[PDB]
């Protein structure tokens, strides 16, 4: 067994973190007060779930989690919420004033006054680890903390834990719920400074989640609560293999091995099916073939883009529920004769499949219906670069006029960081196009 530490940075990272850890507890039968009746090695153990939870002599199961926000109000409701006895006070780190949606404020100005405190409390978790694999980092692209503090932490974690893997879960900005006009600025700034320090990042475009909640949960105006519970399901499918017995993606290095042949091209696209409304009265359960086919519908992706017009570099199918291999390979045979699935030449056209018999756990009183089988597909397709082109176009529009730039210069940042960051992104768009287009 080898431990993973989760780091949740900013409002988006923290609230999504609340959503995941709630889901983890329900999936492992861990109670709000940290007691896990089914765990019979009391006060210790090295089961697969100890990857994410440590134990106390009193029988408490404690997340291997650090929550970090430069302002206190979000993590305060963690300090007072349903899972208050789950987390140690030293896991929940708050400042006084936030980054004001400014990358430079959260990177240079406020980050400096809290970076060493966070590293010390991360060390304290690392000291509890017999064999740490690395980190899962949850953050928004768009906020000042989520973008700017995260990239400072990702630089120092490479320094202090040089051989540990680091995975991101990243919230890509969408105007239907975004909170600031400069979110494209912050996104590119944090992507440029984090690119070399992240082994494998799963991007979630808030636009895609927002329209899934609308179309498939019948939610008129999706809240963060709505969005975060769906994201938690997808995050849980992706981390299930670290927390449960299996043989696919059993450690953080296998994510990179299985999904990232090229190091800079480390953004797998995630697709999830099925998403069914809980108040949908009558519902016909979808088959293995039906949910696998839905993996190739853009309306189910975490990022709207068209993988027909790119190339694949790897594909992983993560099933939960009543699935057996025979039905998977029949579904796959049918799907390839009907759909455009083109791998890059220097890769085998193939799928890595993982099945977990326990179907998805839904939060009681949530919007998601219980289903008998579900799948999360992790595919490294060049089509996801469409999201980079969208972000970069918005950036070019604003930066050409130097709009809002003074807010960043005001915090110590140089104007040149804007254009270094932007030409890193231009290189990244050209890398994707070489790999995925002839």
């Amino acid at each position: 067994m080898r431990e993973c530490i989760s780091i949740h940075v900013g409002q988006a990272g923290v609230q999504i973190g609340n959503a995941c850890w709630e889901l983890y507890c329900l999936e492992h039968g861990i109670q709000p007060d940290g007691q896990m009746p089914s765990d019979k090695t009391i006060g210790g153990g090295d089961d697969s779930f100890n990857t994410f939870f440590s134990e106390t002599g009193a029988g408490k199961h404690v997340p291997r989690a650090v929550f970090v926000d430069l302002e206190p109000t979000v993590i305060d409701e963690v300090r007072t919420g349903t899972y208050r006895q789950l987390f140690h006070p030293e896991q929940l780190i708050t400042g006084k004033e936030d980054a004001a949606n400014n990358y430079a404020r959260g990177h240079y100005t406020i980050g400096k006054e809290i970076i060493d405190l966070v590293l010390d409390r991360i060390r304290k978790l690392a000291d509890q680890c017999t064999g740490l694999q690395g980190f899962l980092v949850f953050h928004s692209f768009g906020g000042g903390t989520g973008s700017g503090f995260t990239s400072l932490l990702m630089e120092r974690l490479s320094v202090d834990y040089g051989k540990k893997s680091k995975l991101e879960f990243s919230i890509y900005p969408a105007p239907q719920v975004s909170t600031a006009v400069v979110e494209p600025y912050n996104s590119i700034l944090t992507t440029h400074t984090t690119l070399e320090h992240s082994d494998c990042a799963f991007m979630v475009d808030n636009e895609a989640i927002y329209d899934i909640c609308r179309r498939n949960l019948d939610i008129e105006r999706p809240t963060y609560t709505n969005l975060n519970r769906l994201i938690s399901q997808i995050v849980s499918s992706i981390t299930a293999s670290l927390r449960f017995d299996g043989a696919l993606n059993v450690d953080l290095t296998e994510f990179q091995t299985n999904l990232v042949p090229y190091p800079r091209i480390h953004f797998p696209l995630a697709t999830y099916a099925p998403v069914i409304s809980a108040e949908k009265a009558y519902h016909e359960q979808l088959s293995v073939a039906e949910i696998t086919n839905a993996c190739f519908e853009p309306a189910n992706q975490m990022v709207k883009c068209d993988p027909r017009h790119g190339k694949y570099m790897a594909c992983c199918l993560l099933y939960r529920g009543d699935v057996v291999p025979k039905d998977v390979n029949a579904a796959i045979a049918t799907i390839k004769t009907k759909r455009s699935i083109q791998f890059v030449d220097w890769c085998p056209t193939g799928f890595k499949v993982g099945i977990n018999y326990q179907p998805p756990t839904v939060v009681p009183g949530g919007d998601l219906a219980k289903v008998q089988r579900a799948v999360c597909m992790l595919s490294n397709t060049t089509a996801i670069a469409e999201a980079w082109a969208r972000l970069d176009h918005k950036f070019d529009l604003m930066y050409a006029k130097r709009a809002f730039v003074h807010w960043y210069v005001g915090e110590g940042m140089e104007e040149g960081e804007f254009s270094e960051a932007r030409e890193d992104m231009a290189a990244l768009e050209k890398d994707y196009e070489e790999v995925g287009v002839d």
Binding site: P175, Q176, E207, E297, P298, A299, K304, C305, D306, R308, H309, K338, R339, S340, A385, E386, A387, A389, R390, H393
Partner: protein, 350 residues
Amino acid sequence: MYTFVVRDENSSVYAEVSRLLLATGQWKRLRKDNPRFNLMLGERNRLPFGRLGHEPGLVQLVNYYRGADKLCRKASLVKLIKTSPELSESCTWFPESYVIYPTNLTDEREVFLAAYNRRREGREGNVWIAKSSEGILISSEASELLDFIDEQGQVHVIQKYLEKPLLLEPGHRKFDIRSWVLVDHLYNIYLYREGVLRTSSEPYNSANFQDKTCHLTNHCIQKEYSKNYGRYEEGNEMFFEEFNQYLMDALNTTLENSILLQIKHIIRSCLMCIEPAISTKHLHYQSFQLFGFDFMVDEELKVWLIEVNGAPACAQKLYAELCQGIVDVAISSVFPLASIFIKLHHHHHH
């Protein structure tokens, strides 16, 4: 009020579509980089497909199909026909073609000659033509056009030149047929009931093959190095009414029976082949596209597809009717306001 942007000011057809939409009193043109548009009439190169369908509150439509270039560039078409099972190499309506790369830079060059000398083994008609994606050359020896391709720096296609074409009299002269097909967002396939015959003004000559005007039916080369341009038909354009009557008077058949059946068959075959790769049925944006199919009729009234063009122009006395059908069928179907087409569909059972 619907909104639209224009990004292809060299397009005759969509110049006229733009003009028609304004005259409805229900469409406002924005300036080409305003993102808050309902409709994009886009550029030909690097249309930013990745940016459509991410504007909340706007249904968005664009006049091109992403991926449709695999039908509309000559090397792509060959590879499409040769590799797709529903079109196949077992395909009776596409001339024997081979994609050939300059020596300078897969390629079929030595698989080209195996059939070439197969034609030489029985000394069959072994004349071919090579073209690019003016700019062409017909020969009877591989060497001349083979090197011709290396003498240029980009991939070419070599395809069986149709030695025995159908020639209209008076004139003993070649011609080709252009068909205008509109594919809407639902992937309905609309054949414009008006086609045109781009004709040669010079008698076809079997004996010598670099007489470019008697062999190359293209409108540009005709009103240049030909000096009978316009004698027989106005603008070297025969239209379907006329050509039908020639078919009844001279051949005792009709345009519909001898030619259009095969044309409709080829249009649907090509477009249904690529449909799963370019359909926008469940996409965040929608596409339509006007296509120009080009055919040649041989002497036994067999139709051959010579190529597909993704940004076609129209014939001048036809512009008004076609682009109005575009607005009716492709645009106002998505954006209702306050046939000239034949729908191409066929559901045989087996």
